[PDB]
């Protein structure tokens, strides 16, 4: 239907996000081996040769489509993509180089190229008693560690609204024509009480008189971007802890099948769980036309600052009033990130890495020097999505509820500014 993966129609040709596919995908069956052929270089039994010997087969890997299209909201995070990787076994390429020098007949120096094996992968392990205390300490110490960083954002948004109230009174003095309620505001920024100039032009004292005011409002707009984007980054508590498990393997007799290879691969089992907070009525619709990047916020701060412009004479009534219309559109989109905060996300990642390894090698009961280097190709990775939460006493809904009333008081002030 003219759509890639993860898209669905909505209103007037508007793309959405299907919930029956991202959370419950449909895995397939793949039967294809990675390296079905390899070579065995070197000299064996005093006879150098290089052929093309194949290996084994039967590799069933079930994967899921990886999607990174549209997110869930504007200026948010990527949705929970179900990435399932369940291979048939654990295959690792081993570029070994076993050689022995004993007597005159038992002398060889063969180089093993691309050697893999198939064993077992115990993927049945849970850690439901280690990630639960980690969430209690993070929520109990949130009011003590971040108790001062959040308070700075509340006093910053309230201080910006006070400057917008005095700026609105300056526009009303042009239509009315009162000169007493215009020259006294300019003297409030300086130390004493003086006037830089006195003329009959109402727009001459409005530009130069508000020069220190433009430098203070610009610093608030640049600081609000850092005090708002850092809060959304703290909603990614994806911590976890795992243990160790070794894997034993024997009966390895490659090439001439006269020397025994064995070892002990020490895997690294990891299991972490992530939790995010978003709006319960924000991920329903998503439009790319109204998505304004962060570059539009920095442009409005330098609108009044211009060393050479002709906007003061080409209909000035359609320039200062339109500036407040773009500010209300930004506050209307950011206000949805604090209205009714409900737990809607939550992913669980479980992957297996690889650490050190101690491999050996014998030949009919004889110590043989081993100098190989084990690699890692086929591993293990899992990424699902849940919809439950054990403990949910203290939430961020009551804390972020006070920030909604502050943003709504500023949006209603810009709508009352008429021409």
């Amino acid at each position: 239907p003219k759509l890639p993966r993860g898209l669905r129609f909505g209103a007037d040709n508007e793309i959405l996000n299907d919930f029956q596919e991202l959370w419950f995908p449909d895995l397939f069956i793949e039967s294809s081996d990675t390296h079905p052929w390899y070579t065995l270089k070197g000299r064996v039994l005093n006879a150098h040769l290089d052929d093309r010997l194949p290996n084994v087969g039967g590799r069933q890997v079930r994967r899921t489509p990886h999607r990174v299209t549209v997110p869930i909201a504007s200026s948010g995070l990527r949705p929970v993509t179900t990435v399932q990787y369940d291979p048939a076994a654990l295959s690792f390429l081993l570029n070994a180089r076993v050689d022995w020098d004993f007597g005159n007949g038992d002398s060889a120096n063969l180089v093993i190229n691309d050697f893999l094996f198939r064993t077992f992968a115990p993927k049945e392990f849970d850690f439901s008693n280690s990630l639960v205390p980690r969430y209690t300490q993070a929520f109990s110490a949130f009011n003590a560690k971040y108790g001062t960083m959040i308070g700075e954002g509340l006093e910053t948004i309230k201080y910006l609204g006070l400057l917008l109230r005095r700026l609105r009174e300056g526009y009303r003095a042009v239509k009315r024509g009162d000169l007493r309620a215009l020259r006294r505001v300019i003297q409030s920024y300086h130390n004493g009480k003086w006037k830089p100039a006195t003329a009959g032009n109402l727009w001459l004292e409005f530009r130069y008189g508000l020069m220190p005011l433009f430098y203070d409002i610009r610093d608030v707009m640049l600081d609000w971007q850092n005090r708002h984007d850092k809060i959304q980054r703290l909603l990614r508590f994806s911590v976890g802890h795992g243990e160790d498990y070794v894997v034993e393997f024997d009966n390895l007799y490659p090439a001439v099948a006269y020397f025994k290879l064995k070892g002990e691969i020490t895997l690294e089992r990891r299991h972490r769980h992530g939790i995010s907070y978003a709006n319960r009525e924000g991920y329903a619709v998503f439009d790319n036309g109204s998505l304004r990047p962060v570059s539009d916020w920095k442009e409005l701060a330098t609108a009044f600052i211009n060393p050479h412009e002709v906007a003061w004479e080409l209909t000035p009534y359609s320039f200062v009033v339109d500036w407040f219309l773009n500010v209300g559109d930004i506050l209307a989109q950011q206000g949805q990130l604090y209205h009714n905060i409900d737990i809607v996300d939550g992913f669980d990642r479980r992957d297996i890495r690889l650490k050190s390894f101690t491999i050996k090698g014998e030949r009919n009961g004889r110590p043989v020097n081993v100098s190989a280097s084990l690699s890692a190709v086929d591993l293990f990775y899992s990424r699902l999505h849940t919809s439950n939460l054990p403990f949910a006493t203290l939430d961020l809904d009551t804390t972020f509820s006070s920030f909604k009333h502050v943003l709504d008081s500023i949006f209603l002030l810009t709508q009352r500014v008429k021409r």
Binding site: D51, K123, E248, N251, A257
Partner: protein, 419 residues
Amino acid sequence: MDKFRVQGPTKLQGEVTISGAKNAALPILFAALLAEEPVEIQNVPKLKDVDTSMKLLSQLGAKVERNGSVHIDARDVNVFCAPYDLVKTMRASIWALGPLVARFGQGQVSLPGGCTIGARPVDLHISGLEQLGATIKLEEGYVKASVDGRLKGAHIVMDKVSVGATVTIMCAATLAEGTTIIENAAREPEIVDTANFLITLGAKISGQGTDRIVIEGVERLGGGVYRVLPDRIETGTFLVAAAISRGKIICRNAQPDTLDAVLAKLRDAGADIEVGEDWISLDMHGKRPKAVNVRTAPHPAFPTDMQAQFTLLNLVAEGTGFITETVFENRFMHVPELSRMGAHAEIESNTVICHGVEKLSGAQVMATDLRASASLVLAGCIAEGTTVVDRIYHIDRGYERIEDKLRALGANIERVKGE
């Protein structure tokens, strides 16, 4: 991909006819390359591995035909190069290297694959030819072997007991000059049934079921008539589905002498087992099975060919049972498939810990092994839920018309087309 869909739960009451063998019929087809007289083989079911060997011998130059009985007359073989799509399909195709150097003079056998059961212990297959009189050489995976005259006779000192090591030495020492004594052989029932076919031809091999067998070397033999005995695994597999459903099944055409220690442990659990010569009865009287702790060992004393067959029975029992696997330490695929249904287990080193639960729920499973494919189909006849088995092409490799035998007993099973 074709898949099944068994519902229920129903009851399994009735009789079932045991078909031919599988592991015992493969060495018989390879022994006809040395005989210059047409032999007669009976009791051969239509399987995937059986039909694969028919096309392999047809490309070599031996005209084969069958309709009611197998009559292979291999005496006009001219092509020595074997294809690659037929050797990698199965696993026991490497046993043909014996007769392709005893009577002819050359042969090219590639590396087989088959099902994922381990690391392919082919170390004893190469050492078993140098002591007899062969040349160690290979090119592009084709194991070449050329030697003038028959193979010599010498005492072979083995180290470990394998599966294909006994068949390789036995099938390559019949017409060879000299007396060869196999030390520490395999006493599995597949060797006893295979040795009976050589006695009819004219071989002087006495002492079946013993680690030390004295093989007498002869010059040339001829043809013979011998009926293949039914499989012992198929008889014991149907007894597990009846014990978990609390019923009664009467078997026909079985070999009680091949399953001595298999039926000995089930008698103490509280089940009436009736012995005989052609019929084996078993009943549970509605009781609950128990758990046994018997270590895997070559026949007798619980053979290693009953791992996945008694895995589901130990889970539905009570207590704590463990089975120490020392042969197939890499075939651990039937454990993750049963854990999704609602069971818990743990594999420590080389011993699986089986607990004791009641019933499970049917879900989507995947069968990638041979013996692990029958345990997933019989579990759906008693569980509550839809059982979907992925990759069902392994069931037809050892069982012919499995959906038709279970239909008369009481199981709604149908075949769904795929590719």
